[PDB]
Ligand binder design. Structure first.
Ligand SMILES: Cn1cnc(Cn2c(=O)nc(Nc3cc4cn(C)nc4cc3Cl)n(Cc3cc(F)c(F)cc3F)c2=O)n1
Ligand SMILES: Cn1cnc(Cn2c(=O)nc(Nc3cc4cn(C)nc4cc3Cl)n(Cc3cc(F)c(F)cc3F)c2=O)n1
Ligand code: NA
Ligand code: NA
Lengths: 302, 302
């Protein structure tokens, strides 16, 4: 029993983190096989960060302008290339701790673990969701550029996020590992705005199922609703609309608890219209939306 | 910016987890140097779990009744001894991934990371606090017995918790790594009750400082209070009393924010008497008490 914000074990990723310095600019990189992946922003000097011309800046560098440090060992850069917003540094040593891995772009609403790193050293691990406005509500200080987000499927690390910047509202933005931004952001040191965020409805329903599994049942009720009446209320409250795909995804949890999805939707409609009135669910006084159906199954069934 | 439930990176511990089986009873163990540490409950059969006589049960076993599996490799048990509630299995191979480590007993109110494991394999990592009633509000399924809790100080893993059981209320109890229980529990499969829990006041104040650092300031006010008037209100609300030691521990955070501890106490007194009225702090609608002053500093300053 119990329900916590649970991250994936980070050891397989920790062995891939390095420090990358170009001049006095320094950040984290990811060392897989004989390539180091890092934000191309590392090739900027102070003057360059506000409005860089990356193709120009890269032409002016040589392999020896790049200092890669893997703990004590320095790694020899033998080639470099740019792919969208990442830089790929070819090094002369393949990382012997390279896990089985793949590069995967995630969708809004999906969760992943973040390994926060500073000067190439892992500092902490936490779980977070990609928000509908393509930002994450992370926890990052100066120096965390290049930290990665990942999921684990069996023995395979799926890398899905490389951290680039903090926006003025204190939320975070980054790219997939092919260097393509999540959201309408660009890698320059200018103020950019995220679009308005929304609540991830299918995740809130998954978390209500988790509560029932853990014995929190006070919000349940005898009523049912239809997708359409639900979505008309949800829209009013800045909730993502629910689809029949969402309903099938919640299948295993409906099975395990015997409560139909549209039955649980009727409970959610009640909570939205009446609030919770000082009761809590799984120790929270707000509706949680950062746990996926799969997160709940992984944690409440194994 | 941002503030998350952040665990320590788990790689150094992941390499120490093994599976221990005695008969058909199986659970997790911790392999450091040439010793495997695990809950002595593993020597119980089904019939033995309700009221075991461990000294008898251990006399009847031989080194070959113990199957230790480190992934694929089986490890040869060459001696065994019992220390309080743990079993120490001497094996013929020293773990080459043994980190620098120490065994440390923590106090109520302190936090640690848990690596949840099943059949010797790491499944997830999360952060939690030792509650004042010596339980933890973990997240664990059948098969997690033997999972460990730890902190990291530089390069040194401090092990502080070995998981044994879930109590009827769904909270968890275990021992330090010398086998001594936290709290008034015993390792038998009987219903035991935890004492009443209380809110960890110094942690709530640390979390309010974190909020101010992240720009949440609405609860602040011009008033101050004294330790004594504060403690008379706190007691009423089932909060741990605050000591002058707690006040000095909050020192760095008072410095960084310019708000004196007894000034922040006056804000806490207000929140306790008036509630929060649908406002949130750091994304929560409840007062959080699972972050220590040191957790806040580590995460908000580096
Ligand atoms: C508070 N916060 C939360 N997340 C972040 C991440 N982040 C960061 O760590 N560093 C950045 N700029 C740099 C400055 C440097 C100074 N030196 C010596 N070396 C430096 C290297 C970096 Cl990367 N930034 C800003 C930033 C980074 C980008 F990659 C980008 F495309 C635009 C940006 F504005 C930053 O957000 N800080
Ligand atoms: C739901 N939950 C949350 N945490 C726990 C931890 N836990 C556990 O994993 N296992 C236990 N009993 C066993 C049964 C076995 C059946 N086989 C084949 N092998 C088994 C091994 C174990 Cl350890 N228990 C119960 C338990 C374990 C103890 F170590 C103890 F001292 C008293 C107890 F009641 C358990 O709580 N389950
Ligand atoms: Na209902
Ligand atoms: Na005040």
């Amino acid at each position: 029993s119990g329900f916590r914000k649970m991250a994936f074990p980070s050891g397989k990723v920790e062995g891939c983190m390095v420090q990358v310095t170009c001049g006095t600019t320094t950040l984290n990189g990811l060392w897989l096989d004989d390539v180091v992946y890092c934000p191309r922003h590392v090739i900027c000097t102070s003057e360059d960060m506000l409005n860089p011309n990356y193709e120009d800046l890269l032409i002016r560098k040589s392999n020896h302008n790049f200092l890669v440090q893997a703990g004590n060992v320095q790694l020899r850069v033998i080639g470099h290339s740019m792919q969208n917003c990442v830089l790929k540094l070819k090094v002369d040593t393949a990382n012997p701790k390279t896990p089985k891995y793949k590069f995967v772009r995630i969708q809004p609403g999906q969760t992943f673990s973040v390994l926060a790193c500073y000067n190439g050293s892992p500092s902490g691990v936490y779980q977070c969701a990609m928000r509908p406005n393509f930002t994450i509500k992370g926890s990052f200080l100066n120096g965390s550029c290049g930290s990665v987000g990942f999921n684990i499927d069996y023995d395979c690390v799926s890398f899905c996020y490389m951290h680039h910047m903090e926006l003025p509202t204190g939320v975070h933005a980054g790219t997939d590992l092919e260097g393509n931004f999540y959201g309408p952001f660009v890698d320059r040191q200018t103020a950019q705005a995220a679009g308005t965020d929304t609540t991830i409805t299918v995740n809130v329903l998954a978390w209500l199922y988790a509560a029932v599994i853990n014995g929190d049942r006070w919000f349940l009720n005898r009523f049912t609703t239809t997708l359409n009446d639900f979505n008309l209320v949800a829209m009013k409250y800045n909730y993502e609309p629910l689809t029949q795909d969402h309903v099938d995804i919640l299948g295993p949890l409906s099975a395990q608890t015997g409560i139909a999805v549209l039955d649980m939707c009727a409970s959610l409609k009640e909570l939205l219209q009446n609030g919770m009135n000082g009761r809590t669910i799984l120790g929270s006084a707000l509706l949680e939306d950062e746990f996926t159906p799969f997160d709940v199954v992984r944690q409440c069934s194994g």
